[model samples]
Target: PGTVDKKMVEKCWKLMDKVVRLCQNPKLALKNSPPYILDLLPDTYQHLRTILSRYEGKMETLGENEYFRVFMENLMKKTKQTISLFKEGKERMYEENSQPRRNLTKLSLIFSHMLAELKGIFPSGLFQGDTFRITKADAAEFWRKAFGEKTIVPWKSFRQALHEVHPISSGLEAMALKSTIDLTCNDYISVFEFDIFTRLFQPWSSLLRNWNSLAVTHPGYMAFLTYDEVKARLQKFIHKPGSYIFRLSCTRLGQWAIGYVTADGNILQTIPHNKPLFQALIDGFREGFYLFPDGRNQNPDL
Candidate 1:
């Protein structure tokens, strides 16, 4: 029920307390590193800080007459080792992404480290098995939920939306953009617009749920679902029509999954599935459309 070295722990409490206090300080925490203090301990940062704050309040109660020097030193050494492992884990990410550019490998390392930390702290198995994969059925279901039908919006629409209008061009722009050339038009729009111009501006909210789920669940195959992947997939399916569009959109959405969830730059280049193509779509939407609203200064309209 009690620690084997309870007496030793009590004797060395002051030193252990000091080591933790110094490590807890935001100013003294890591600088310019991926495994920042918050990244390593996650929610524990605030929890640990709160505990430390309480301990500081009763500092005088912990007298200096104690002398469990060896135990205290060992305890601090272990704590430092944990921090060092986190640092080394992140460094492996940089190295993995640099030489051969194994983005998935780096991502797996990052995810595994996070999992290890979570287990260490909470011992919970919240995420388990096949949670991240973007399956064909999931893709089909996403569209059916969003649009009630699997309709194909052309790649041109997606590209058009990617570009922001110049101030002069925008002043003359129409409210609802029309598709100039219609090779084939579907009565239903997909989960989100796919027009190059308008689609690029709109947030792909319809697909966010799938994207979020897959990033954590299926980090592998994420990179293959980007715009570039979309282009490649489309090139292959150009003649297939209907179902091909559906499959391409689904695969593309999965590829974008990681970028949609994680911050940019976390995934390194070289890994086919690690780069955040999903983020690029989001970035294009924000920069190309949302930031520049030219209409009636209409607060409600936007």
Candidate 2:
């Protein structure tokens, strides 16, 4: 049996030491703060590659020094697992937030580290150099086939198509869609009132306009309007002499809208998020203000 290479063993141990230190204080190792993980992971991975390249042949042939061989093998294995864990943690943070500013930062960190690792571990030819690049025409074609017409695909559909085409290195799909495409949800709702809602209900529009003035500029008026006060106001509106009953409902998921009884006694659903109108109506419903013609409290489930 050949003698062990002391130099190789020392170099492997030194590399392992760096990984061990990183594993000790994971927060620091992952570079969670200002300097950021992306800024440091490439350098760490490059150092690893350099070490591996220098002692590639010697790792398996450490002859009678089975201890060093086992140690080196285990160290590489542990290092790969640690890097994988870091990638997963970074991905989870991005998924949970989903805001553009935070998503871009986390995505950059993930792909930079991922590419660095790929290059370090595998031959260049194994994966295309420009695997991440996608042209507008390419994206448009994908949208045409997957979603039809290619007017503008939503973010979710675009992501799925990209994943199917290149699952191994599709990490950049989200970032690319956010930057290059007009990917947005059609049913997305906003807090602020829109003119479209006003056009749909003119009477409610006036109420909303007045309420906006008080809510935005008059803090005292806003403070004076409590939950009970709002409920009472809605009850009065619904019970106005000669006027029919109006019902408002909201799901636990925050899907809220209004419905009013027609001349035929059928209920017609109307605008959602009309705060001045629906806000009080929701409050009244929650507070047990709703009642049937027989004078029984309306079922909360309905």
Candidate 3:
């Protein structure tokens, strides 16, 4: 195989290293004092714990005829050990306890190995162009140094090569990881009320209100009814034969009004579905959802 261009290789290597470092130690750049930072550490470990537990449960339920039972058991054990190490590391940080740099260094290796596994399943090119740029060989090498050569081999399209391997399982694995992260965050919020949660909730409420208003007031929704359909639906509410004027849901040019026909047969609440209405809703909500609003910095539009 041809070597990647030297400049491209260097760039890819640097990006890969950065991505690994960030994923392994997410707390590295976060403020220790922020309530959200405290949430992130425990949340990450709790997620890892859930993943290992699920894997162990699967291992226990596997049939005796399964040839990969031994592999599953070993992987489950390693996952458990990694979770334990993360917990220990977090506890040490919490208690202001210091250990050798060796303990911290192990995290990078663990993450590198994890990336190698992902690279085996996912396209190395996909990771390289978006955020991770390392070649498959370099990624495997990074992990080999961390977890040893016995665990990783040259990038293999395992699905094509191995009959027993299920390629679809990668999608399931990704879903499991997402579910773990979401569940762990919910649990953390249940146990502890953090300022960031309030900040998020405020914007959530505003967005909900904005969307709900659009759903209720927009005539595009009402325009699903035709002229005959609208007239038929409103016939019951018409008091006198000549008392009401027939107004279609849309103007003659087919422009929709924001309101629908009232029981009184008037489109009294028509609102233009223009930029001002939408922008106003967004600006109002953004104003309400700030972690810190001090002095003249209270302007949301800015």
Candidate 4:
């Protein structure tokens, strides 16, 4: 038998105990906002399994560990079963109500377990503190440069610019995102649209590293028009409007940008701070803006 630390086995048991408790207490799991359980659970399970695999040979050396092996097998089985149930629940909910559903308790519990596993693997305080912080003055300066001194810009026109910049990709990914809007109220904007908007106008990756801190730094600033507000504005502009436009207030970077949801439910990005041209284009379209294929329209006499 190779040298195997009994303490390592003890640690694994302790982690398992925590995971079991999390699964038992659904209420505690959902105390805060719903978490992405499906995403969290798979990652957590994979990480734990990887760790166990590293100690596979050593397990026999520690104590002909039949119990430990059984426990690990059972844990994996339970996790798989839970994930299957979750998927089924979501499918049923979507079918019944034509909407997306989240199991908050399950999500929260899995997220908690995931965090615990990560903490055990990494140094203490590895996840602590903000990755980046921006001062109020710095934020204001960027906003000024991006959209003048005013913190807010016209949401309708701004979204138009975004649509012009990032046209919707013709694919299932786009379709999936668009379909989810009717399913979940909170998911008004698609991830695709937001990613495009962030990349084009903000130092996205840098700011994303500490988005939590950045969002809280300027709590008072209305970062962008809300989903409802944009929807209302769209309705006002066009009867039963198929598309909506909104702005994103990038506080940490002190910048603002626009994005829109097309009638087809695709989220598109537009150019930032180019409202005048977009407005002009919109007006032109309304005025029957058109051109002949050749020079016929330009030179009617010819």
Q: Give the per-residue Cα lDDT of candidate 2 at 69.
A: 37
**Cα displacement (Å) at residue 122, model 1:** 7.0
State the lDDT at 5 in candidate 1: 41
In candidate 3, what are the lDDT values of residues 1-302, reduced to their tens digit?
22223343234334434433433464444333212223333433344334334445453332221212222233333334445555566545333335612343333333323332223322321211112222233333333343242322221322222213223236554343223212111111110111111221222224224323433333223322344544554454343222112122211211232223343444223333433334533443354321111112222322
lDDT of 1 by residue, 234-273 (tens): 3433332221111112212212221111122121222114
List of clashing residue pairs for candidate 3: 128-132
TM-score to true structure, per model: 0.20, 0.17, 0.19, 0.24
Candidate 2, which segments miss by more than 4 Å at Cα?
1-4, 24-63, 91-302
All candidates: CA RMSD (Å): 22.0, 20.8, 23.7, 18.5
Model 3 misplaced regions, further than 4 Å: 1-75, 86-91, 95-97, 100-104, 121-302
Of candidates 3 and 2, the better by lDDT? 2
Clashes of each: 17, 0, 1, 9
* Models sorted by lDDT, best on top: 2, 4, 3, 1
- Quantify all predictions' global Cα lDDT against the true fold: 0.30, 0.36, 0.31, 0.35
- How far off is residue 107 in model 1, in Å? 13
Q: What's model 2's TM-score?
A: 0.17
For residues 19-125, what per-residue lDDT tens digits would candidate 2 score against the true structure? 44543453332434322434444444565455456556664442333322332343344444444544556535334344432543433333333333334223331
- Which 10-residue window in model 4 sums to the lowest lDDT? 293-302
